[PDB]
Amino acid sequence: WTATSGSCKGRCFELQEVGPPDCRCDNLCKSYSSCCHDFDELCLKTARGWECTKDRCGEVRNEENACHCSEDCLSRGDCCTNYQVVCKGESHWVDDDCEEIKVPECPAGFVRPPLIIFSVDGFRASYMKKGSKVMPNIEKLRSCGTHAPYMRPVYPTKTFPNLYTLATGLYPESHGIVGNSMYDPVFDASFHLRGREKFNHRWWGGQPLWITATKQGVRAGTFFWSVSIPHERRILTILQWLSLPDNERPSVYAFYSEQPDFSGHKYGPFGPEMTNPLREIDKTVGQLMDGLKQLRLHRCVNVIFVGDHGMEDVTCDRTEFLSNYLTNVDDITLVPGTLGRIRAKSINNSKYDPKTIIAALTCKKPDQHFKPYMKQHLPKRLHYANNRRIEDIHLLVDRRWHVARKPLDVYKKCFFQGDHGFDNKVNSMQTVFVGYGPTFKYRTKVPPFENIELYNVMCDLLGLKPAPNNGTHGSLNHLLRTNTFRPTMPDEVSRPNYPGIMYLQSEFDLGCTCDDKVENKLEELNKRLHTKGSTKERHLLYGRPAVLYRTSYDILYHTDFESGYSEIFLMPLWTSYTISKQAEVSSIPEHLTNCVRPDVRVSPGFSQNCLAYKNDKQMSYGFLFPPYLSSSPEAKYDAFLVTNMVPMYPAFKRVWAYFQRVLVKKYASERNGVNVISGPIFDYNYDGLRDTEDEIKQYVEGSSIPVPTHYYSIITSCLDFTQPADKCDGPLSVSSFILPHRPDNDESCNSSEDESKWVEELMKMHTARVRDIEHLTGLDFYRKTSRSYSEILTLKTYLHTYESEI
Template sequence: MDNEPYDHVKSCCKDRFKITKSSGSGTVLPSRVGFGQKRASRCALCSRARSPRDPPRPRRPAVPSPPHAADRKIKNVCSCLSVDPAVPHTSCKSRCYEPFDDETPGCRCDAQCVTSGNCCYDYHDLCLLPTQQWQCSRLRCGEARLADSRCHCSSDCEAAGDCCTNYRHVCHGETEWVEDLCEDLSAPQCPASFKRQPLLLVSLDGLRAEYLQTWSTLVPVLDKLRRCGTSAPFMQAAFPSKTFPNHYTIVTGLYPESNGLIDNTMYDPVFDASFSLSSPEKSNPRWYHGQPIWHTARYQGLKSGTFFWPGSDVKINGSFPDIYRPYNGKVPFEERVFTVLKWLQLPDDQRPDFYTLYLEEPDKSGHNFGPVSGGVIEALQGVDNVIGQLMNGVKQIGLHRCLNIIIVADHGMEDTSCDRKEALQDFVGSVRDLWVTEGTFGRIRAKNNDTCRQPEQKIQPYLKAHLPKRLHYANSRRIEDVSVLVTPKWLYPGSLTFCAGGAHGYDNDVESMLAMFVSYGPKFQSQTEIEPFSNIELYNLMCDVLELLPVENNGTHGSLNHLLRRPPHAPVPPAEQSRPSECPLLSLQPADTLGCSCPQLVRAAADRTHTLFGRPRALRGGQSYCLLRQRGFISAFSHHARMPLWSSFTIDKPVSVPLPSVTPGCLRADVRVQHCELCLLSHLSPFVPRCFPLVHPLPAVPPDLNTTAEQQFDALLVSNVVPMYPEFKKIWDYFHSTLLMKYAFDYNGINVVTGPVFDYNYDGRYDTPEMKRLFVPGTDIPVPTHYFAVLTSCRSSSQPVSGCDGELQTVSFLLPHRPDNSESCRVSPDMTANRHHFFFSIQLKTRRGNRKRSRNRNNKISAVSGCCLRH
């Protein structure tokens, strides 16, 4: 057969067929493009050219072929096989990674299309991005399921439980969680398979509290959680304000000195080993003390799933959480959220009740760029988007009215500079023989007791025993003998390399170290702002949410009851272990005049009490004391310590009337107490020079506080005397004569309870008699290590404290009692010249009723004092 029929076929079927030849003959065979030889066989007759799938046709009788019969036959073949022309492909919709077929017209979607330059326009969006991103787009809705997709937007993704978190928003037009109004969650709605409401604990590392106020419009999801849930202006981190100590404090309720992680880097002299975040020791359970909440849950029949949390990938107490992930900072935030959402959809017998989720930002950006920077703003927006994905996903799986969420930070962030450094060498010379921890908080292992050298230096070194008690940072062998507090924005370097950008680890009272707190869910109050609190309280709170019984910890169980709609634990005051006795009136004539004859000033004991809110209770057994009532105060006199255990008095709002003068150097005998209990202390005249350290007998309640002569001379009773160093007396006098009077004026009167504290082994617990090591010279009267003061006022300043029938506000102080305060290095004795030094409260717990609104931090009761009042 010649080429003429071939040309006719080519002309006839040029856009529909490719032309082949049958084997063994010259017959031209048309074949449908894309179907190859399967579509057409020999084409001598139409029936032979049909595809096997075509329906059979009746045969026609054979007739002689007219001229040009071959041409008509080929045209009949074209008509016989006639189909629509092949439509070229223009999209990768449902075609991602379809094998390449060179017979297919149009663009390609196989993996090699990029190399050939023939990819469809949506290849990147439909085939590549799903393997890299965690969001649906309009193009992806109804997509064919891809095995390598991070999440899915196919029509079956809801049944499979692996939809992208914005699937229903993008593909079904539903609103995102952040767009919804605040919901009433008082009636929780959980799926039938949930026996209890789950709890998710989220950490946004380094998100200082101030960020949420300054940049609230840039973080709409976090801002909505704050507005719709329960929040605090700030949450106080534990000291030091570092990542590992605080994360482990949050889940154990223990201060770092008790939970074992006293810093991100530390040395244990017993183990003779060092711990750091990059060393194998990080995974050694011997460093971790206490019981983290995932173990509390396990021991009480619940399950836990932790997607990163310091300590969660360590075999503490012989076990891990039920589900956990070894830490890997390279895991995308979205993958962490998606995994937690998958855990929430597990079958009931596998699903955790408690979850953790940890994100490294904005801490990482804060270190790199500083706390006030574009880098931190970008990081904040990034974590806000991730939390938005979390809330969308929770809503999508129907748990937005069931899941309880707590979002916290471990600490804040402060600006630092390489120009603001204090080198240890400038103070002690060579440091080659010292083990020094550098940065925002320093620790030194040293035998010598050097004092500081420069009055205006940016560091304050403390011996372990002298560290401020409010730091709770002494009772651990891993804490060095010397600790160095650094002024905010400054660094304490040894061989410090990274100094520019941001850092944390400073005093946890510094504003920039304060962390964020937000909670949301049916267990929590709605649209409520509470007072600031310490992160040691979170463990008890989480146990209450999960209906668990917490183990012993440093928090106060029930102190956060006002966060909960229905708190399960009602705190009860501890039972008194030692009841007071009455001090009998033995004689109206004192056995010893004490060198001072004041018979005309002797007054009868007052019968009015100054314990407005109840008498302080003795929680240790075996104590012997009696109550002494005077006109201006009431005290509990200890027969063992031979001094008041506590003294309570009320200061009404002062009027501008000068106090009567005090008879100097005159102590009165107290006829209610036997002479032998007082004589040793009373004969130590404050005017007799003695060897250092000199201890003076001074009134626990200064006479100048009283408003009448009778009350003043009651304060001169020898039963009101306590041993006190001269340097501390300056502080004590300033505290009582200036600060207490100021507070009484500002808050319409205050009730004050003061007394001595004994903590010679600096473990934060009351010392037993055998632990007391320092005594008044020539006596067995112990010298206190601290003095405490608890101030209480009415929250409404329109009511006097003596007639308050509403909520109370309380603040507590612990003042170190030492012969000197050399760590402050200040030469000026003027207390008012150093008003910028604050010693803040150690507790903000006492309350009457639920306190839901926070007072301004700058307006709360707090004392300003000289350099010695360093907590």
């Protein structure tokens, strides 16, 4: 119940929401069917439009007008945004030359530059170039401020997940808004675009920026605008708030435009109909900037122009139907469209089986336009699994396509020509970032970055401490003139042991054999040197990784590689080696095919054993430092140490062997040497975070050897490829991956072919940031470089995407 009999008199767009059943006058009352009876008449005036004209200049104030052109309007804070232009001979902001804003130039009474977030729905990154002719205000913000060529959204690339990620710095699996539509089985409740359930606070996890500000004594304008409030009225409301007394005035504001997304769905991302929506958004930016200029705020406020996601060409005819794959299509519920999520239609149905559903959806049709996954097998870069609202079965839909349950859903639910929601690496899903103001840099281009990073920066702009989030704070310091955040490296928690030779070969009873008993102070002096770390500078280029949790581990040195060997997990946490452009690939000699050698620095009790591998009929083994890249026949023996061995399914060994034998040398040739760090990852609860030992669900049969869920590699070289990876004077370049350690290659539909036709494609799908590997391993990399820590933070957030040019 709402008693709409009260009045909005003097309350129009009031900042605090009054509670039912008293009627509301805030920018959301429409959405709740709760506004006071006179809200339209008082608060949504439209009379005479939005622009001053020559004849209105100096007019008698008529309070009925949508905005004013009378002499008192500036002090009242309610002139039309073009008042000073039409009536006082001023220029539009867009027509002014840009001039660096070295310091904030604010009216007295302002404690900090305000932040205005101007968010545009469905604004594809390429609109900045492709639409530049029709967007002069936006182009001036872009060229004069700080901009990225594009900003990467989160998955799924839908409206609510991305807006709330922008507000919180959290992945959707952590903030809880994991789609535009959701079922939460614990609540037994459904979140829908239409209706009231979505207003309930239980859906919205984390701490969005307006709450962070409010808790730290910084007032916030509301971020939500009812759809029927016109854009012009939104801008005028912001401008009026900016004229409030100091004690009442917010410091952070948001504007939201439903365009260009609205038209993009109807016309496709580059339909000729799209030019007008772009022009209209630019006019709205112009209104804001002229309004700020009138208020003497245009060299005071920081403005962020940001989108949530892009827009792809998708039509009704490009739909895959599950009814062409499944016999039992009526026993499932599908969340459909540019992603799919499947669960049982009824929890009482004991014949429902996820394994048989997945198998019926796997590589069934030659050009099939979606791929099924159990959520824990999705690429770890999507961070899309640790939430009960994410169904176990997921369909990753190819760009340009939809998935639906049955044909009748597409015609009894072509209309649309555009959509979004696909994998967040897809070029068409990228979106925009521009920052303009005293706190941002002048005429500066920054590389692409992820939208999870922005919350920390918004916090920096407002002097707020950010709530715990998934950004890496400091990685966007290069966007800022001032207010940078200068973190310190995390403290190493566990120091390594440095074991020397402590065991005789006969103490080991591992069931391992090696043909190595074939026999000089010239070469015996040299091998002692190698085991003590004499080549360590060549193979450990950025310092050893720090271990950020409590554990017991050893540093092991070798001619060709160095490792941090875990006594708890019985294998390396990391193995580091450098391969020059000149390095040669050799084979595993026939006499050495099955060779495994005890490591006389490491106790039998802290070693793997070969018998467990023999007895485990599903599990084989591989090596972290590859025997193919040994520097010499004699150095190759080091590669077969029991301490370099890790468990690997035969199907995965196909992947691993091709990476090690073919791809590493290929990267060293292309990149002028590479440094490789490889290792295992254990994430059995799919939370993106390193498992403790008691979380491990699978061991090599009969042993305490834990099976990794993933294998990673971090591949670093010099950004200036004229310098070799091991003699690099300046910035670095990195690509990394986190490969799922699976007992089949069902993910790769072409896996019956030679590895040269499918392996690198799989690896590209499982591209990762160094930071993703840090979370998964509790390791901290790049501890000793010549580089600033913020620059290293940016490097750790980099993602090599393999998409062509934007």
